[PDB]
């Protein structure tokens, strides 16, 4: 939950510096967005509506904890 000292340009992963990356996912739109913390990777489905995307992201982040 801590941003890098310098900022988001200092994002680091297992292999070293790695900036936040968002990758399209063609799976079923009902699929909850997935993430890989080892590379700050976020696989996101192309939600048609902003409300649906917000709900899915909220569900993902809340279920993470």
């Amino acid at each position: 939950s801590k941003v890098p000292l310098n900022g988001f340009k200092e994002l680091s992963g297992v292999n070293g510096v790695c900036k936040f990356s968002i990758h399209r996912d063609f799976g079923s739109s009902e699929r909850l967005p997935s993430s890989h913390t080892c590379f700050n990777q976020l696989n996101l489905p192309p939600y048609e509506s902003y409300e649906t995307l917000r709900g899915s992201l909220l569900l993902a982040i809340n279920e993470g904890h």
């Binding site: 297992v14 292999n15 063609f26 799976g27 997935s34 890989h36 080892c38 590379f39 990777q41 696989n43």
Partner: protein, 146 residues
């Protein structure tokens, strides 16, 4: 910790359960190079892939770092060579050994895991476009496995 690494090297050179050949390089026991043969009944068959392993100084208390030096076409393997593997990330235990992780890598190559992909494009291609996945994997193996 060097004794554990020596034991693992002796075991690998004695009876390596996995279809692979790995050993230290540059006179350093903490840096290793490994070769994984292409499993049969798969487009990777007939191809050998090269991997680089870095052993943490706290081994076996810390998982080894594994990267795919050889370019491969796999949903769960990054193009740059990064890998996703639970046993090396959160499930690592001191009881685990280099041979065990090599066997796990060989299996993952045998059965991909589209459910947790590092490249959604390849995952979708494999799931719904098996012919394209097989063809592209064969081409990549021919180009960068031999």
């Amino acid at each position: 910790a060097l004794k554990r690494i020596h034991k693992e090297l002796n075991d690998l050179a004695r009876d390596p359960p996995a279809q692979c050949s790995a050993g230290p390089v540059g006179d350093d026991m903490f840096h290793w190079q490994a070769t994984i043969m292409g499993p049969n009944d798969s487009p990777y068959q007939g191809g050998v892939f090269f991997l680089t392993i870095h052993f943490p100084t706290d081994y076996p208390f810390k998982p080894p770092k594994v990267a795919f030096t050889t370019r491969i076409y796999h949903p769960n393997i990054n193009s740059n060579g990064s890998i996703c593997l639970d046993i090396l990330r959160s499930q690592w235990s001191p009881a685990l050994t280099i041979s065990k992780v090599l066997l796990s890598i060989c299996s993952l190559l045998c059965d991909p895991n589209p459910d947790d992909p590092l490249v959604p494009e390849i995952a979708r291609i494999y799931k719904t476009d098996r012919e394209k996945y097989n063809r592209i994997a064969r081409e990549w193996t021919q180009k960068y496995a031999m």
